[PDB]
């Protein structure tokens, strides 16, 4: 396993915005409770899950546990940065797997719910 993505970086400029607060309170916390959220709540453990090629393929890993901790730690500058992390998470699942795989069906459902929630954001 490589080290997981950082959740703190003292030199990085940070900001609290209404949209980032909404991404944590509403978007993250709703997706987190979905029946399909569990594979995505922590970094992929390639040793535990016996996926020795996972990080041979996936070079920008991302997961909702990392996103949650970034949001709680005030890591982001803006909502778009956080949205990009969600998109990286979904894309990684699609890249490492194949259409029709159970885990891909899970990511597809979560991505549709994610887009539904970010379609309208607070001002
Ligand atoms: F680690 C991640 F994020 F779960 C993840 N991303 N791509 C993948 C590809 C395979 C995988 N095997 C872990 C156990 C498992 C076997 N069949 C499943 C069907 C749905 C969910 C988990 C599984 N886990 N995996
Ligand atoms: Cl601020």
Residue numbers in the entry: 44 to 166
Direct quotes from the study:
BRD4 contains two tandem bromodomains (BD1 and BD2) that recognize acetylated lysine for epigenetic reading, and these bromodomains are promising therapeutic targets for treating various diseases, including cancers. BD1 has four α helices (αZ, αA, αB, and αC) as the skeletal backbone, and they are linked with three loops named the ZA, AB, and BC loops. The Kac and inhibitor binding site (ligand binding site) of BD1 is formed by ZA and BC loops, and most interacting residues reside on those loops (yellow and magenta in Fig. 1a,b; the key residues are illustrated as sticks). We characterized the binding modes by determining the crystal structures of BD1 in complex with four selected inhibitors.
In addition, the substitution from methyl to trifluoromethyl at R1 did not much improved the IC50 value. The overall orientations oftriazolo[4,3-b]pyridazine are nearly the same in all four compounds. The N1 nitrogen atom of the triazole of the core scaffold forms hydrogen bonds with Asn140. Two hydrophobic interactions between the core scaffold and Leu94 and the core scaffold and Tyr139 are common features in 5, 6, and 12. In addition, the hydrophilic trifluoromethyl moiety in 6 lost its hydrophobic interaction with Val87, while others maintained this interaction. Another common feature of the compound 5-, 6-, 12-BD1 complex is that the indole group contacts Trp81, Asp145, and Ile146 through hydrophobic interactions. The W1 molecule in the 6-BD1 complex contributed to an additional hydrogen bond with the trifluoromethyl moiety. The C4 and C5 positions in indole and the C2 and C3 positions in piperidine were electrically neutral, and they interacted with Trp81, which is an electrically neutral residue (region III). It is an exception that the fluorine atoms of the trifluoromethyl moiety, which are highly negative, were close to electrically neutral region II. However, the fluorine atom of 6 did not directly contact neutral region II but formed water-mediated interactions.
